[PDB]
From a paper:
Carotenoid cleavage dioxygenases (CCDs) are non-heme FeII enzymes that catalyze the oxidative cleavage of alkene bonds in carotenoids, stilbenoids, and related compounds. pmcCarotenoid cleavage dioxygenases (CCDs) are a broadly distributed superfamily of enzymes that catalyze the reaction of dioxygen (O2) with carotenoids, stilbenoids, and related redox-active polyenes. These enzymes use a mononuclear non-heme FeII center to activate O2 for reaction with a specific alkene group in the substrate, generating carbonyl-containing products of importance in biological processes such as hormonal signaling and light detection. Unlike many mononuclear non-heme iron dioxygenases that coordinate their FeII centers using a 2-His, 1-Glu/Asp “facial triad” motif, CCDs use a 4-His cluster, three of which hydrogen bond to second-sphere carboxylates (Glu/Asp). While one coordination position is occupied by a solvent ligand as demonstrated by several crystallographic and spectroscopic investigations, the other is vacant because of apparent occlusion by a nearby methyl group of a semiconserved, second sphere residue (i.e., Thr/Val/Ile), making CCDs five-coordinate (5C) in their resting FeII states.
Numbering used by the authors:
A (entry chain A), B (entry chain D): 30 to 526
Amino acid sequence: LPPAPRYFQGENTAGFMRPVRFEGDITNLEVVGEIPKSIEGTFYRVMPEPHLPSFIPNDPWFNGDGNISGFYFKDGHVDLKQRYVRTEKFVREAEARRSLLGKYRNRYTDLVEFKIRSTANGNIVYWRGQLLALKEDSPPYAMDPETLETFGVYDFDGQLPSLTFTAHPKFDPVTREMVCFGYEAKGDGTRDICYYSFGPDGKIAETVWLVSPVCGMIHDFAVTENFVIFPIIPLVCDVERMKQGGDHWQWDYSIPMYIGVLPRRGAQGSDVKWFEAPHGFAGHVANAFEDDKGHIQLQMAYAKDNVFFWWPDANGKGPRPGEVEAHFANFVLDYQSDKLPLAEPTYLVDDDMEFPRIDDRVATRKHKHTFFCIFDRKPGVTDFEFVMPRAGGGAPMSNGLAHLNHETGDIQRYLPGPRKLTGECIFIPRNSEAAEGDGYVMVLLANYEDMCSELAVLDTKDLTNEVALIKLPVRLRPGLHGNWVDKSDVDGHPAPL
Amino acid sequence: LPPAPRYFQGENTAGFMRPVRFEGDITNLEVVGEIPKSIEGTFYRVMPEPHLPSFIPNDPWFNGDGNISGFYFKDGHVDLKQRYVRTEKFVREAEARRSLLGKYRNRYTDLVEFKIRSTANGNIVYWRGQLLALKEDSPPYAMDPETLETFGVYDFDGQLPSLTFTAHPKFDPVTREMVCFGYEAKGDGTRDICYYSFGPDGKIAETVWLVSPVCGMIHDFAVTENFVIFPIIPLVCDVERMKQGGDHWQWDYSIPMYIGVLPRRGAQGSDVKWFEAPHGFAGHVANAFEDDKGHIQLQMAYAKDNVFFWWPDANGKGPRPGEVEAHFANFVLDYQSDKLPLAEPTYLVDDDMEFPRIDDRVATRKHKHTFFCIFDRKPGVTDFEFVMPRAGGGAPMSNGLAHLNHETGDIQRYLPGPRKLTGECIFIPRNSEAAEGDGYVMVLLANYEDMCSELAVLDTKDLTNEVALIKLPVRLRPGLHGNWVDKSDVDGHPAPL
Ligand SMILES: Oc1cc(O)cc(/C=C/c2ccc(O)c(O)c2)c1
Ligand SMILES: Oc1cc(O)cc(/C=C/c2ccc(O)c(O)c2)c1
Ligand SMILES: Oc1cc(O)cc(/C=C/c2ccc(O)c(O)c2)c1
Ligand SMILES: Oc1cc(O)cc(/C=C/c2ccc(O)c(O)c2)c1
Ligand SMILES: Oc1cc(O)cc(/C=C/c2ccc(O)c(O)c2)c1
Ligand SMILES: [Fe+2]
Ligand SMILES: [Fe+2]
């Protein structure tokens, strides 16, 4: 076998990116300021965190074993519980005490044959009394919300029709449906997309098989009252390249950014329309909704080049680190239109941004508040001379949050400080009567001065001010998505506005 | 109640002394170099680590909740398990989410009435299939060696005759007895010492009640073939002072360092002889043995002033931090002598030292190897300008280990580096046939550059060289005692030479 390294090496595991790999508990976290006593619930987040050194050099951040953090809040006190998802990969590698899974989404490089290759490191959502740890090449892994025990691969009582389940299902706050899809839904290199949904009772509702024009990456999607929308990143998969040891994904500069639109209920596969947006990178969706005219307003991060620059085109053409900005775009789509090309989007703000969140009580409907990460290159905002030697590589950087009020156009910006960076935020309604976007924002900070993590609590009345700063004595490696599960919500999801 | 702080403040919890308070697992620790594959067993150590901020300002290091680390070795791989002892204090404070126990060994300052005030933070030893977490004001807490679960207060099947059990029992390698005592054995301020022992079958053997000349601190003791030996630190307890909120301990410059000698088997309390060594501080015992003449050679750390300077005399007189050195002393005692005053000891080395270990296969018998912590003020050995601002306070500092060969007088010194300090080492026999003092030494390092801990593995053939350096991504706060439990030893203790 290729030798197994016994310590981590390379920039992707240096500095603040160095794996800690702890599982367990830290109760009664230290708090500067005061956590509002009325906050009750749990912030779950997932980070990629390799449990064992990879035999693949410069293994991407996206390929690390998913480790779940839960921050449990009650009466102004907070406890941390942390545990790895017991994926097939995690368990077999733990047994062997060495890495066995190879390159990202390339089974031809694995040292053993895996049935499930999930690292379960994309998202951690709540559904019908379980956590689901998501990874878009795999079914979910189900976990216990209280103990973070892994139950195992979850197939929705034998109903799951797809080999793959998106990291970005949407929760309809009115119907209480979980709306889902998977791409490469019949395995490596397949252009099959399976669109499917589950009612609040756990029974499958929709199942529609459609066909993508290319085998392209569909990381996120959007859901409106009457439509589902599939933006395709121009990363394309060729299995013959993979069999020779090559990358799953390769940029294609010659294609549009396809945006498929399908009727949400009762459709056939042939009902999809593949609109063609200008070439670019489909980032995370804030939210989509139908306006008065029945037109889809799709609000999402959008870049004009390959954000995932480590997967360039066939000739190695692509951007350098830190070069590509994504902007908060609005696309207008009309399902009734026969014109496939779409105009350039309008932009809601100037900021280099990503990881947009809304008040999910209006998900799939018109929203007027968005919270998002920003990266401001303006001199002084980040002390790069101090931070970059301590940062490692392989993960995106955010040096603030912004709150856009879409009606007034007012923006507030939270800057944690020149030697701190942020992850994706969560929004918490102040209470069950709170107006849209009124409540608390929490975000995990990397503090490069202390080389510790912190959890900031902000009030939406003034996003510039920390109400509380929870001071962890360990590092939580930069992670991906996370979710709030409020104690007042019996099914784990907030009530509609 | 006095207010409960919600974050740690003061020098005793600053820098590397800041509590982490993690419990759980980190498997497959990163390793630089190579752990000898034949090493099989577990290194257990205990640190004081306050679970909650104290309502007592500048609470001493000795008053922190005991947290147990286990480093489990097999086939050159190592896993960490970490868990707090579930003392009465730990559990009640966890339930309340605030500190309730008050000043060190002063129940009159507690916010609730405790039955057992143990922090179980002094030592962690193996006995008849359990760990015993020791604290000299209390009985032991029994724990599971594999899971570190706490079973509860341990009273040896109802046989424990004393309220108190020393942090420093001795294991006789020939008889397989655990030889024990407790001072203040009938409660606060009592001069009762209870000497007791347990045979390898768990049955109590000796129980002898004796009377100390003063109510002084007897932190450690020594055992030979035919005698047990009780050195008294001139810290003295007055319960009336304690009832007014004063300190348990107060130095007395007017008394000798008493050294009691009692026949090991069949004695009455009146058989003790209280020899009178020159005034000074009784540090940790390396080992004691009887020579050819039947005279006791007692080898221990010994200082000429109050090492515990935060407990000065009645008029507040005593040394400053970093002023008092302890030296490796040899005292000669003759039980048959009627002369009580003892000569000044001879000194085996000149180093400022503490935390001596021997090859416990010759415990209670003549030894010719000692391993110990040293603090060398020689320019450059420690980079104080870098270290001291990051160090915090309240704990002793060691910047190397030394190995003394008592026959040849040769000393080897291990220096981890200018920005690292050490804890107490353990010795591991190379194998069951190894000569005395031949095998491995392990020691936990504080790395102030990384603000991480590391576990160094040394071969006694050359103590200056690390064969392996195990790199923890967290800090383990400076701790006290620890022990090796070898897999090849059925009763957890090594076979006699
Ligand atoms: O030694 C082996 C051989 C093998 O062929 C499979 C396994 C483990 C399978 C597994 C363990 C945990 C999971 O969560 C999961 O999806 C799969 C272990
Ligand atoms: O900074 C960004 C921006 C973005 O729009 C998407 C991502 C992550 C996508 C992803 C893609 C494949 C994976 O396997 C995975 O875990 C995550 C990260
Ligand atoms: O009056 C009370 C009230 C209470 O809420 C708890 C206790 C004691 C609990 C305890 C828990 C664990 C231990 O190991 C132990 O010795 C004691 C006593
Ligand atoms: O650096 C030193 C030198 C020494 O000779 C003894 C000690 C520790 C003694 C101790 C005394 C009382 C306690 O309650 C406790 O946990 C520990 C520490
Ligand atoms: O006359 C003295 C007395 C003393 O106590 C220390 C020094 C110098 C210390 C030193 C010099 C160089 C270093 O790199 C370093 O860590 C420490 C000089
Ligand atoms: Fe995502
Ligand atoms: Fe001790």
